[PDB]
Amino acid sequence: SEEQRARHVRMLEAAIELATEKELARVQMHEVAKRAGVAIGTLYRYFPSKTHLFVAVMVDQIDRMGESPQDAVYNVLVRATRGLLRRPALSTAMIQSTSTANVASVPDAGKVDRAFRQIMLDAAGHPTEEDLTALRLLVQLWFGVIQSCLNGRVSIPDAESDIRRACDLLLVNLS
Amino acid sequence: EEQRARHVRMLEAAIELATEKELARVQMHEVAKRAGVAIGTLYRYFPSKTHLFVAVMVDQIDRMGVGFKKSAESPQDAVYNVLVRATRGLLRRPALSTAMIQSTSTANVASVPDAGKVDRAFRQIMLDAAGIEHPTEEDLTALRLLVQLWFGVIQSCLNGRVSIPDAESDIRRACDLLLVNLS
């Protein structure tokens, strides 16, 4: 029952751990089960494919992310940007799997927009539409930026330049 | 210039295969067999698959720019209208669009030098639609933020996370927010 919940935490770190040692294309499901101490049936039972598993990693990694709402939100993005960019292999596994997952095939993928949101609301401090939209528009851009970062387009101080603007421009009138 | 009709059939065939099967199921040897060319001829012109689909994207951005300057209210509005046009024509062939979008996401710019070109080609359609001839850097920045945000919305749409009217509605709000200072 909680043997079962620990079993779940084992698989996610196993996965995290492998995406660092190895690029996503070469991370192998059998290495994930073995390293997680689970039978291989159980692994795929809970994560039908590699995509399902690094989307679950994605969701789990978000759940773990000054005063003025813009600044706080901003500051949470700058803090999360630096986290993802000095683990670029793990970040790539997560963002590639996410940017790629169809929501019908990988249900957890329809949970990532909802999970970023809860943490933008928790960064900004009840409110209505325009807020959700500015906030929704902003994470989507931030993905772009992160991806654009993961592939030589923007560097880190370039990327950071753009999320600053993005924040200020998208959130001129957040309450 | 025969490297042009040769070039065209390569792109042509790539488009049909990505139209019929997902990217993972698109193989260089079948593109070679469609374009009626040697595999080495194809590899010469597109060192890998991600190269080829980046070039397909550039051709497709070039093509829609043409069609926009053909039968098409503020700068931010005009820019909205191009984005709406592209979103629509991409969403009409999801399978092909997915291959072009995924290709442009994974394509390191140092390694595949056409990867830059798409940002540029795009940026110029919008600049033109807005009728700005002399971009301030603030303008360029704003538009780099837009196509970035935009790519996300489409990707999201293809994956079934947002509906299409809401994708469109989000591209509008973004235009209004991002392009306040467009002179």
Q: How many domains does chain A have?
A: 1
CB distance from B180 to chain A under 8 Å? Answer: yes
Q: Out of B102, B107, B152, whose CB is closest to A100?
A: B102
CATH number where B5 lies: 1.10.357.10
Q: Is the dihedral of CA B12, B49, B115, A54 positive or negative?
A: positive
Structure obtained using: X-ray
The structure tokens 């973004």 sit at B174
Quick count: other Cβ atoms within 10 Å of Cβ B36? 11
Q: Which residues of A touch B108 (CB under 8 A)?
A: 151-152
Radius of gyration of the CA atoms of chain A, in A: 17
| Structural contact between residues A17 and A35, judged by C-beta atoms closer than 8 angstroms | yes
Check: CB of residue A53 under 8 Å from CB of residue A89: no
Which residues of chain B does A152 touch, with a Cβ-Cβ cutoff of 8 Å?
108-110
Strand residues in A109-174 grouped as ranges (E):
none
Chain B, residues 3-62, CB within 8 A of chain A, namely none
Q: What is the resolution of this structure in A?
A: 2.5
Range(s) of the domain holding residue A17: 1-175
Q: List, in order, residues 6 or more apart from A117 with CB less than 8 Å away.
A: A132, A135, A136, A139
Residues in chain B with CB shorter than 8 Å from the CB of A147 are 105
Q: Count of residues for chain B?
A: 183
Best interface-test mutation with B: which of A141, A142, A162, A168 has the largest number of B CBs within 10 A?
A141
What residue of B is the nearest CA neighbor of A99? B155
CB contact under 8 A, A169 and B148: no
Contact A142, A62 (CB under 8 A): no
Assess contact for A60 and A16: CB atoms under 8 A: no
* Alpha helix stretches (DSSP H) within A37-173: 40-46, 50-62, 69-85, 88-100, 112-121, 129-150, 156-170
Distance from CA of A133 to the nearest CA of B (A): 8
Q: Could you give the residue ranges of the DSSP H alpha helices within chain B?
A: 5-20, 28-34, 39-45, 49-69, 75-91, 94-106, 114-130, 137-159, 164-178
Residues A36, A10 contacting (CB under 8 angstroms): yes
The b-or-e profile of B15-27 (16+ CB within 10 A means b, else e) is bebbeeeebeebe
